[PDB]
Structure 1
Amino acid sequence: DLASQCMLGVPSYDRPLVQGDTNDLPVTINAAVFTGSVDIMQGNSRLQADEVQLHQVRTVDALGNVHYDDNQVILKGPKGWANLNTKDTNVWEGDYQMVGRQGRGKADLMKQRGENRYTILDNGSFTSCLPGSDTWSVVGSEIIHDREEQVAEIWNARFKVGPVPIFYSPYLQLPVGDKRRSGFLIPNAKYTTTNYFEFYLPYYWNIAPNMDATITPHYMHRRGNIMWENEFRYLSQAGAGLMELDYLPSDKVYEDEHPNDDSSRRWLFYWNHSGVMDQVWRFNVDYTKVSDPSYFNDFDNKYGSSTDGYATQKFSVGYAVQNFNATVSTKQFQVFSEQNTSSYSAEPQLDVNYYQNDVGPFDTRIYGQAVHFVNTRDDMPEATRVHLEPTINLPLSNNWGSINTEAKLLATHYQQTNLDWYNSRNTTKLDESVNRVMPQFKVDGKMVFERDMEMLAPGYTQTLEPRAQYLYVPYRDQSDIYNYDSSLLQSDYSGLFRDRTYGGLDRIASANQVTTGVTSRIYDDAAVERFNISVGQIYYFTESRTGDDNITWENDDKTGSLVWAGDTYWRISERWGLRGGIQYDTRLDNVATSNSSIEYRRDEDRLVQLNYRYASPEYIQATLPKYYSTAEQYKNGISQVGAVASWPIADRWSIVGAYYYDTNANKQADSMLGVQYSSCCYAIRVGYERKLNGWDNDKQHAVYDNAIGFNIELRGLSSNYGLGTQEMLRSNILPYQNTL
């Protein structure tokens, strides 16, 4: 390994270690004047010389190849001097080394004044590479090594990489250790295709033990103006935030592509707070605001990418003792795509609860809500909502079964206002006062079987658990209630057993279904499951008619076994894996979704992966909005195929890759390729990308973007001793996930 390979350059203190004051420690002399290999043993400090003369104010004069060995310092030099009163020593021209950590140097006139650890040179130079390798040096005139915190100081500095200087500005400090010091950082570069160049120049700050600041200018050569990029961080009695702000004075390409505007500016505002004060109160903020609805296509950020549709703006406040709750939230949104902008928003919500759990053999629970919708264009309806939900359980149990009989009683009372335009235009008319009361009923069940596999595997056990369900929600006409927060849900195997078809509380479908399904499982000898298969159907006794059935299937059947599902999970060994999934629908006459995966993970650096996805065009025709079925960009569905890899070469290199095909119309959706060196003094990093971006309207031809990153770092006077692989495997538009 590189760490163990480089570790054999730093000498270590093998002699016994003594903790405490060294002033009262005994003195040993081996040889007033002593001639010939004089040895001194004073605590951890050891001195060697051909000639040592002691003159007592105790002064010791050592001459001739004088050595030194302290707890964290080794010296060398012909002429020496010593004193016991202040623990100060003087050593002439020679070489010095750092023991216990890397660090090397040479000087003309040294000094080891006992006060703290301040050493002084006169023509010195402090590098960080192992002996025998000349790559870089920090050459100055006077250097003072302070060791109370982890700080170094340099005067008249002249950074040299080889026998050539590349720097000036005398007072600069190299922070050696693992303590934060307020200073500059290292720049980067790029050659992206939207702007012909790129350049950064960070700046750090450490206001308090829990505070930060990361001011960072930025160059955008194509445009021509520096875009300032501030930052912030904190940590307090409630969580930790990540405030941000990215100002930019003006542009030129934006003034040319989009003329006749007042001014061209840019900004941003990020804020992510999440904490739990004391033990009851809860807090949450997820603000994100942008200036123009094209920001993410342009200069990129680490808080949002090209694949995006809106920008969330949410608050929260919470109380939760043990059987109670409350919340005053606020959700608003902002849509980027400038095609149709009529998004809704939620004004202060409310969510009460209650959890009394011992009444007789039954249970108890209550819900509640009070919301006030408002739309963003002066003429779409705005309304109010109140909700209630008393429920009751009756759980049974046994060693091999269960029953979960349930009940409920829903209620709601809208009050709609500002109904002029919608009432005048369309046919169905909305009213100003509606109500809705509908009961429910649900019965559950379960079983478990077992066996001892006599077959190939001796000692393996197999289980087989069936299941069942029921449902009954009466039918009430809901054509007088605008659809505010209702969407059609998916149905995997886990979602098969559910009492809701539409999310939210605006539209509730009728039901007379009878679900089923079985599940098997093969255990190991020491109760380690390594196999799950699953099937399940649904038998509609009567279709679900919510009152507004504006869905366009191919064959319109109502009753019969309609939905199906599936699942699998294999765990071949500790360094493998396999997953899957599949849906179906007799109303579409085609598979609606399908997944797959496979993995191999020997360590954090070697891994391979494959995957598959699917979505039939009839799904996108019967679920997504109406303009998703006639445009040439969305009508064909998703049929992509991917692959990931990574494998170290020799002991310092690392190679990464990616790919994502699209078999429906042969194209390419991603490509990444980044090598990475790791020496004992520096590192190197490269990158690439071929992401998709935009859709040209003229001849229906997509637009691609290239990119070439670059990085460098000073390594050796720190603790980071790992190759950068995970930090580079999460940079493409479709990041990598762990499926083991």
Structure 2
Amino acid sequence: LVTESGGRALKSRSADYSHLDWIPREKLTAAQLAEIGPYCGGSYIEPVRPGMDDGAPSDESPTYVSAKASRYEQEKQIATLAGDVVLRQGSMQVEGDEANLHQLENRGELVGNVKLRDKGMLVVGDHAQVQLDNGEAQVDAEYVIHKAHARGSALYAKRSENAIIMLKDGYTRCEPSSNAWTLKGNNVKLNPATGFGTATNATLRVKDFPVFYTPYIYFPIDDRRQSGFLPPSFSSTSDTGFTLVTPYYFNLAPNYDATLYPRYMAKRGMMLEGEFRYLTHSSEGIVNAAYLNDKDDHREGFPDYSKDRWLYGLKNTTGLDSRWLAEVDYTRISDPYYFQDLDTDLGVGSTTYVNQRGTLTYRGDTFTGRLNAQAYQLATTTDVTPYDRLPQITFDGFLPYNPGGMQFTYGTEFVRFDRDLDENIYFNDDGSIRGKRPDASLQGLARATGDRMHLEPGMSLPMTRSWGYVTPTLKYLYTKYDLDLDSQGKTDLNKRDESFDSNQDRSLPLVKVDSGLYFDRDTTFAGTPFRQTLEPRAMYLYVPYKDQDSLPVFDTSEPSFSYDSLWRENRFTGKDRIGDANQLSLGVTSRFIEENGFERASISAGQIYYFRDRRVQLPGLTEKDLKRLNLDPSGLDNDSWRSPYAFAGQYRFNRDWRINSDFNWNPNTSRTESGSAIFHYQPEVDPGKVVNVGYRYRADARRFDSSRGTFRYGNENDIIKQHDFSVIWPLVPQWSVLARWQYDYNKNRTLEAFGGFEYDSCCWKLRLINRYWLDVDDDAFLVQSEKADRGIFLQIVLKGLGGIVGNKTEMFLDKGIQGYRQRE
């Protein structure tokens, strides 16, 4: 009352906060409503007056004076303007109830409902005075910044000749009545040059009750400049206990910023982390570093343990506008266990490796050359050391040709694979064995390194008409290996009654005919004109059989069967195995297309028919294996004249919901190999509603068995049978619930689960989440295990403090619910 009693704005001045330019919601334009949130009770809209946008130069504009009466006193030489006094000069305007000019000094005084106005700025006070010789001024007071919807007050405010403003007992975003939270600096200094301000005896108060103190604090004030503070994240997990993370954001420039994440963790220590992001017309990049001296010694005497824990990396891409493209993707970590311990911001799916990659790419018109240095650093102790491609030179392209003639294509690769096997053996205090590194299970050619060359020319004759096409094509593939093998791996071959042939070459032709038709029927379903298409397709593929059981495996894998398996020249990837093929793939697609050409739904089914047997396979699915007594479940799919049935299908509904699904049924064994259905929902009108439902089954994986040194097919331990549900939905005008659950049927365990609410209001916002997940875990015996983690996540948000920028403390919400882009 009559003074600044904290919390709310002075209601004694006006009943309805008219003096702050406050207009309630029911009297605002739609254009103005569009600038405030859904729950805000009104806005500060500055009255329109001549000269708001002309700038405010000193004597550039005539002074506009207006008042109802004037008077003059003769003993103290003061000239007074009574009545409703208003004085503008360009941008700045000044309203008062009485305006005294003390002419003995040069002092203008203002008594009455004093309003100081500038562009987007209002000050309302009881008294103000200015020396006219040098700019010195004092105000006795509350202030509105209309643009930022901010308000505040000060017992007084002063301005010195060099323009430095001082406030005693000072800011908030809340609507006048709200009093929800205020930032109060006992002594505030605002420098317009240098653009920095200071508060001493700085206090964060909530409902007039202090909750945070510091005796000094810095902050920018020059419009929007390169700083801000982010909503802190108070969390608690089972491997970090109580956690506080208080990120700080630098808006360094319109093309790059940087963020700084200090975390305190009860069970860990003070982890310091930071990222720098940049973006230009021709480049983009992000740099990450983090350090922590970890106080947790649970992983003592573990292999490759480090009590220091750090990560640095750069992910960079420059020269998108030029034929030269330089990408980097490099990360290094201190110890394997890093993400198993410090990745509590993500929960489920901590990575088991980190990329270390540089790549140069020249991208000509006809051809493309690429030099690529690439390695991997393992975030686990239970995986075999990966090979690294130290050079991989790559030229791919064609020869300029006449329309309707031949098409000559060439591709070459040179690449040098290497690795340093770490096969240490760890024993207990007694005579027995504690743990064996996985590399120790690799034998024979599995321990090989070396260079590989590959030439691949080919010719194609694409005869195509509107009603269909037939494109035959012939390619030749020559590969030459220069291998190296340690003595260990050679003796492993002596025992297998084999010998090591270093120089090894392979030459094979590849004949492939592809042909399909095009059909179009017009239909109208649900009153909509669809142009349903029908495109059948067939591919004949001949590759003669050549024994490749003496060629190591560096970059080759065998993908699971799917609708794309039909159309590929090789059922393996890479160059290390070429699949003896004598086969005809048949399939058909049928797209539904709208008038705009937007594909609204599609369906595809297909099968492959095998005339010959499929003899070349990975190491461990030829005759070097299957010698372990019986054959697996469906691994004995050689000599079967028919691939599985391949079904796929997609339905997208105008960028509001989309559903994808695929099925793969094998009749030779009467068994489903692979299927999945995925549904995603998120309307355009209300991106606050979000629903993800997914099912995934897959048992036909072919992976590398870490203890057998070889590949396997039927791995019952890793059969995927999973459902993933997640939802984000608004219950009642200010409340919304979000949750997610992912369940592993095959072992009947929950992989991740979490749920929480999110209360929204005009000036602040609260998010609370209870969570439980399974973290990737390596134990002391080099055995993978499942380590459940529980946790709780708390976020309190003061709207309007430069924290409208993505927070990295919310990763588990971004990853775990596609649709996290709630934009308000």
User: Which residue of structure 2 aligns with residue 81 of structure 1?
Assistant: 129
User: Which residue of structure 2 aligns with residue 575 of structure 1?
Assistant: 656
Seen in structure 2, the aligned counterparts of structure 1 residues 589 and 340 have a Cα distance that, compared at 3 Å, is: same
Q: Which amino acid aligns with 2:560?
A: Q
Matches of 1:237 and 1:527 in 2, distance apart? Answer: 31
Does 2:698 align with 1:606?
Answer: no
Q: Alignment RMSD, CA only?
A: 3.9
User: Which residue of structure 2 aligns with residue 625 of structure 1?
Assistant: 705
432-441 or 143-152: bigger deviation: 143-152
Q: Which amino acid aligns with 1:373?
A: F
- Candidates 369, 393, 396, aligned match of 2:463: 396
Deviation at 1:657, TM superposition (A): 0.8
User: Which residue of structure 1 aligns with residue 532 of structure 2?
Assistant: 462
Q: Which amino acid aligns with 1:609?
A: N
- The alignment covers a number of residue pairs equal to 728
Matched ranges for 1:235-634 at <5 A? 239-254=283-298, 257-258=300-301, 264-276=307-319, 279-300=322-343, 306-339=349-382, 341-359=384-402, 361-377=405-421, 380-418=447-485, 420-453=490-523, 459-524=529-594, 527-546=597-616, 549-550=621-622, 552=631, 554=634, 558-571=639-652, 575-602=656-683, 603-616=686-699, 619-620=700-701, 625=705, 634=716
Flag the structure with more relative contact order, 1 or 2, with Cα contacts below 8 A and sequence separation at least 6.
2
Deviation at 1:671, TM superposition (A): 0.8
Seen in structure 2, the aligned counterparts of structure 1 residues 209 and 737 have a Cα distance that, compared at 3 Å, is: closer
Question: Contact 1:176–1:718 (CA<8 Å) still a contact in 2?
Answer: no
Matches of 2:251 and 2:525 in 1, distance apart? Answer: 66
Matched ranges for 1:648-727 at <5 A? 648-693=730-775, 694=777, 702-718=786-802, 720=804
Deviation at 1:708, TM superposition (A): 0.9
Matches of 1:485 and 1:217 in 2, distance apart? Answer: 40
Q: Is the partner of 2:409 in helix, strand or coil?
A: coil
Q: Can you list the C-alpha shifts for 1:81-100, whole angstroms capped at 9, x where unaligned?
A: 35666676544x34443344
Deviation at 1:150, TM superposition (A): 6.1
Deviation at 1:614, TM superposition (A): 0.8
Matches of 1:458 and 1:337 in 2, distance apart? Answer: 54
Q: Can you list the C-alpha shifts for 1:94-121, whole angstroms capped at 9, x where unaligned?
A: 44433443333333443466976x5433
TM-score (norm 2): 0.78
Question: Contact 2:143–2:153 (CA<8 Å) still a contact in 1?
Answer: yes
Q: Is the partner of 1:481 in helix, strand or coil?
A: coil
Q: Is the partner of 2:393 in helix, strand or coil?
A: coil
Matches of 1:237 and 1:522 in 2, distance apart? Answer: 37
Seen in structure 2, the aligned counterparts of structure 1 residues 433 and 36 have a Cα distance that, compared at 3 Å, is: closer
Deviation at 1:58, TM superposition (A): 7.1
Seen in structure 2, the aligned counterparts of structure 1 residues 506 and 86 have a Cα distance that, compared at 3 Å, is: same
Q: Is the partner of 1:333 in helix, strand or coil?
A: strand
Deviation at 1:404, TM superposition (A): 1.2
Q: Which amino acid aligns with 1:28?
A: V
Does 2:73 align with 1:28?
Answer: no
Question: Contact 2:110–2:127 (CA<8 Å) still a contact in 1?
Answer: yes
Matched ranges for 1:106-145 at <5 A? 106-111=153-158, 118-121=164-167, 123-145=168-190
Seen in structure 2, the aligned counterparts of structure 1 residues 5 and 87 have a Cα distance that, compared at 3 Å, is: farther
Q: Is the partner of 1:470 in helix, strand or coil?
A: strand
Seen in structure 2, the aligned counterparts of structure 1 residues 124 and 311 have a Cα distance that, compared at 3 Å, is: closer
Q: Can you list the C-alpha shifts for 1:606-648, whole angstroms capped at 9, x where unaligned?
A: 02232211123xx25x655386999999437222223211112
Deviation at 1:240, TM superposition (A): 3.6
Seen in structure 2, the aligned counterparts of structure 1 residues 371 and 692 have a Cα distance that, compared at 3 Å, is: same
Structure 1: unaligned runs, 5 residues or longer: none
Deviation at 1:595, TM superposition (A): 0.9
Matches of 2:381 and 2:731 in 1, distance apart? Answer: 48
Seen in structure 2, the aligned counterparts of structure 1 residues 449 and 692 have a Cα distance that, compared at 3 Å, is: same
Matches of 1:246 and 1:274 in 2, distance apart? Answer: 22
Identity over the aligned pairs, expressed in percent?
28
Matches of 2:246 and 2:529 in 1, distance apart? Answer: 64
241-250 or 530-539: bigger deviation: 241-250
Matches of 1:203 and 1:664 in 2, distance apart? Answer: 43
Question: Contact 2:457–2:475 (CA<8 Å) still a contact in 1?
Answer: yes
Q: Which amino acid aligns with 1:414?
A: Y
- Candidates 90, 105, 116, aligned match of 1:68: 116
Structure 2: unaligned runs, 5 residues or longer: 1-32, 69-78, 423-443
168-177 or 594-603: bigger deviation: 168-177
Seen in structure 2, the aligned counterparts of structure 1 residues 15 and 690 have a Cα distance that, compared at 3 Å, is: same
Q: Is the partner of 1:642 in helix, strand or coil?
A: strand
- Candidates 14, 18, 25, aligned match of 2:48: 14
Seen in structure 2, the aligned counterparts of structure 1 residues 560 and 105 have a Cα distance that, compared at 3 Å, is: closer
Q: Which amino acid aligns with 1:650?
A: V
Q: Which amino acid aligns with 2:122?
A: I
Matches of 1:267 and 1:312 in 2, distance apart? Answer: 16
Q: Is the partner of 1:14 in helix, strand or coil?
A: coil
Matches of 1:280 and 1:631 in 2, distance apart? Answer: 43
Question: Contact 1:423–1:430 (CA<8 Å) still a contact in 2?
Answer: yes
388-397 or 60-69: bigger deviation: 60-69
Seen in structure 2, the aligned counterparts of structure 1 residues 190 and 632 have a Cα distance that, compared at 3 Å, is: farther
Question: Contact 2:704–2:712 (CA<8 Å) still a contact in 1?
Answer: no
Q: Can you list the C-alpha shifts for 1:155-180, whole angstroms capped at 9, x where unaligned?
A: 44344334444555433234457634
Deviation at 1:470, TM superposition (A): 1.0
- Candidates 52, 56, 59, aligned match of 2:99: 52
Deviation at 1:541, TM superposition (A): 1.2
Matches of 1:250 and 1:416 in 2, distance apart? Answer: 43
- Candidates 135, 156, 160, aligned match of 2:205: 160
Matches of 1:418 and 1:55 in 2, distance apart? Answer: 99
Matches of 1:728 and 1:22 in 2, distance apart? Answer: 49
Seen in structure 2, the aligned counterparts of structure 1 residues 532 and 725 have a Cα distance that, compared at 3 Å, is: farther
Seen in structure 2, the aligned counterparts of structure 1 residues 598 and 136 have a Cα distance that, compared at 3 Å, is: closer
- Candidates 721, 728, 736, aligned match of 1:639: 721
Matches of 1:564 and 1:112 in 2, distance apart? Answer: 81
180-189 or 375-384: bigger deviation: 180-189
Q: Which amino acid aligns with 2:742?
A: Y
Q: Is the partner of 2:314 in helix, strand or coil?
A: strand
Question: Contact 2:304–2:336 (CA<8 Å) still a contact in 1?
Answer: no
Question: Contact 2:756–2:769 (CA<8 Å) still a contact in 1?
Answer: yes
Deviation at 1:303, TM superposition (A): 8.4
